[PDB]
């Protein structure tokens, strides 16, 4: 982030022209080359390279070649970067010094999914709702209202039920200078603890299961309560159609008088551990709503260990924002969400004082958030998350489609 | 377009695309749930192409057949208020005559919007949710095509514009765009819900 914010070339886009302004005071850009690329949903379509000849504090106009105009649905992204072809006393050849990304043009997907011939079958006991489609099974616990288990063939896919999550393992900025012996009550973690966010209990209110013309609809309503006060209400719909996809719509209302939650999302522990995480979204590195300008939108493929940031004092980490697609093992999640994926739960991160005491758990913990709080950083002894990065809207909506290999 | 009968309701789902010269500008997906109490819940999900200019509003529009003397609403302010001009409005239960819901600007335009509205009652109709609205005897089309306010004529019924989202109006000057970015509808995807019920 700092490298991106302190870069010596500023970029402006106007139509098909890039204005490059040099922030150097003395030197000409004699070791600078502008590479550009246009991609549709991470698939490259056009690229080129233009030498930079910019006077100190000057401007250079670069007219782009006729950019591709695909008919396929997707969003066009233009990325430019400045490369130093020659090594210097402090950098190697090929060093990237500055970069910038713009959204070029979006084509909305208006093509409909072809109607399926099969229909998922619903079975209703007092304990659970079971939905069967080919080799796939979904089981919802009727006592709790949450999706409790998933089957592909005969292999269980979940270890912990998919449930709403409104908290995160507190950061150094969340804690502030609050101490166990000397409590600072203005700190975010103190306000969350006093409000009962970490101890709030989900209580099922309504649960309906219906069969449509070509799908099965599960609707649930949950209230989170602490000492008689309702902090959050979550209303969820699950639509499982004949293609095996499960669309989940989540609508959450937050009491205006409780402190704004750290996140609004879903959380589950996947049973399988995979080597790689693939995602169409922002950046290769961990990025957050208030720290994401240095992340770029693309298709990223990392090892799972790369999705965890080894902070000395464990906390919420590894989040990737602006994510449209996430692939892990046989599972794919589509929508518009943030996520983190690791072998450590938020609970273990909260209750572990040092990172060497962390131990990997049985499966993979996935946190898919519709909304996430900013992390702050102006200082670490007072709240520093700006109001535009707090979750203060009171009502929140998101959607995510969960599908498997097929 | 799908129509299904549930255990205790009827569900209508529709999907619409708005297209101009081959380009899809907006997609609207709507669900209608009518249960046994007569209530009709409408959920609206709209996606806006990132390259089209940000829309002035995302809402629903209809012309009600009946004309009523009063408009009642639990929401912001007695006076017309907008997302970027609403600090002077207060949240309460307001009851006005219908003529008070129209602002007679000399050159007709969008007017009379009330933001932050949780409940709206007009005649036998009640709309609940979290929305902005304006209600009048003039359509947006007539306001656009009328040069002076004395040329306006009242139409047969009541035009109701219930918006989930509305653009700011600006005002720094009147010769360049002045609506701040926080008051433009740039999110790309938008969701709202409104329950429509009648006397009962």
Q: Where are chain A's structural domains?
A: 7-112, 113-405
Nearest one of A237, A236, A228, A239 to A164, comparing CA atoms: A236
Residues B141, B161: Cα–Cα separation, whole Å: 12
Which residues, numbered 28 to 87 in chain B, qualify as contacts with chain A under a Cβ-Cβ cut-off of 8 Å?
Answer: 45, 47, 49-51
Are B6 and A210 in contact (CB < 8 Å)?
Answer: yes
Q: What count of residues does chain A have?
A: 406
Strand partners for A123 = A130
Residues A234, B60: Cα–Cα separation, whole Å: 25
Q: Which residues contact A154 (CB under 8 A, 6 or more apart)?
A: none
Binding residues of B: 175
The three-point CA angle A155-A159-A165 to 5° equals 135
Kindly report the number of other CB atoms within 10 A of residue B105's CB atom.
12
Residues B181, B184: Cα–Cα separation, whole Å: 5
Residues A137, A143: Cα–Cα separation, whole Å: 19
Which residues, numbered 175 to 234 in chain A, qualify as contacts with chain B under a Cβ-Cβ cut-off of 8 Å?
Answer: 208, 210, 212-214, 217
Kindly report the number of other CB atoms within 10 A of residue A202's CB atom.
16
**Burial of residue B16, with CB atoms counted within 10 A of its CB: 0-12 exposed, 13-18 middle, 19 or more buried:** exposed
Strand partners for A89 = none
This PDB structure is determined at a resolution in Å of 2.3
Phi and psi at A89, nearest 5°, equal -65, -25
> Pairing state of beta strands A395-404 and A331-342?
antiparallel
Residues A255, A230: Cα–Cα separation, whole Å: 7
Residue A399 CA to its chain's centroid (Å): 13
Residues A111, A116: Cα–Cα separation, whole Å: 15
Nearest one of A243, A215, A212, A269 to A402, comparing CA atoms: A243
Residue A366 CA to its chain's centroid (Å): 10
| Alpha-carbon distance values, A160 to A149, A258, A270 (Å) | 8, 27, 7
Are B24 and A107 in contact (CB < 8 Å)?
Answer: yes
Residues A24, A60: Cα–Cα separation, whole Å: 13
Q: Which residues of chain A make contact with B189, given a CB cutoff of 8 A?
A: 336
Residue A296 CA to its chain's centroid (Å): 13
| Alpha-carbon distance values, A20 to A33, A103, A293, B35, B107 (Å) | 12, 17, 18, 59, 44
Are A108 and B24 in contact (CB < 8 Å)?
Answer: yes
């Amino acid at each position: 982030e700092a490298k991106h914010q302190q870069q010596f070339f500023q970029f402006r886009l106007s139509g098909q022209t890039i204005e490059v302004t040099s922030e150097y005071l003395f030197r000409h850009s004699d070791n600078e080359l502008l590479h550009w690329m246009v991609a549709l949903d991470g698939k490259p379509l056009a690229s080129g390279e233009v030498p930079l000849d910019v006077a100190p504090q000057g401007k250079q106009l670069i007219e782009l070649p006729e950019l591709p105009q695909p008919e396929s649905a997707g969003q066009l992204w233009l990325t430019v970067r400045v490369v130093q072809p020659n090594a210097t006393a402090w950098s190697e050849a090929g060093h990237i010094s500055a970069w910038q990304q713009w959204r070029l043009a979006e084509n909305l997907s208006v093509t409909l999914p072809a109607a399926s011939h099969a229909i998922p079958h619903l079975t209703t006991s007092e304990m659970d709702f079971c939905i069967e489609l080919g080799n796939k099974r979904w089981q919802f616990n009727r006592q709790s209202g949450f999706l409790s288990q998933m089957w592909i063939g005969d292999k269980k896919q979940l270890l912990t039920p998919l449930r709403d999550q409104f908290t995160r393992a507190p950061l150094d900025n969340d804690i502030g200078v609050s101490e166990a012996t000397r409590i600072d009550p203005n700190a975010w973690v103190e306000r969350w603890k006093a409000a009962g966010h970490y101890q709030a209990e989900a209580a099922l209110l309504q649960c309906t299961a219906d069969t449509l013309a070509d799908a099965v609809l599960i609707t649930t309503a949950h209230a989170w309560q602490h000492q008689g006060k309702t902090l959050f209400i979550s209303r969820k719909t699950y639509r499982i159609d004949g293609s095996g996809q499960m669309a989940i719509t989540v609508d959450v209302e937050v009491a205006s008088d409780t402190p704004h939650p750290a996140r609004i999302g879903l959380n589950c522990q996947l049973a399988q551990v995979a080597e790689r995480v693939n995602w169409l979204g922002l950046g290769p590195q961990e990025n957050y709503p208030d720290r994401l300008t240095a992340a770029c939108f693309d298709r990223w493929d990392l090892p799972l260990s790369d999705m965890y940031t080894p902070y000395v004092f464990p906390s919420e980490n590894g989040l990737r924002c602006g994510t449209r697609e996430l692939n892990y093992g046989p599972h794919q999640w589509r929508g518009d969400f943030q996520f983190n994926i690791s072998r450590y739960s938020q609970q273990q991160l909260m209750e572990t004082s040092h990172r060497h005491l962390l131990h990997a758990e049985e499966g993979t913990w996935l946190n898919i958030d519709g909304f996430h709080m900013g992390i702050g950083g102006d200082d670490s002894w007072s709240p520093s998350v700006s109001a535009e990065f707090q979750l203060s809207a009171g009502r929140y909506h998101y959607q995510l489609v969960w599908c498997q290999k097929g």
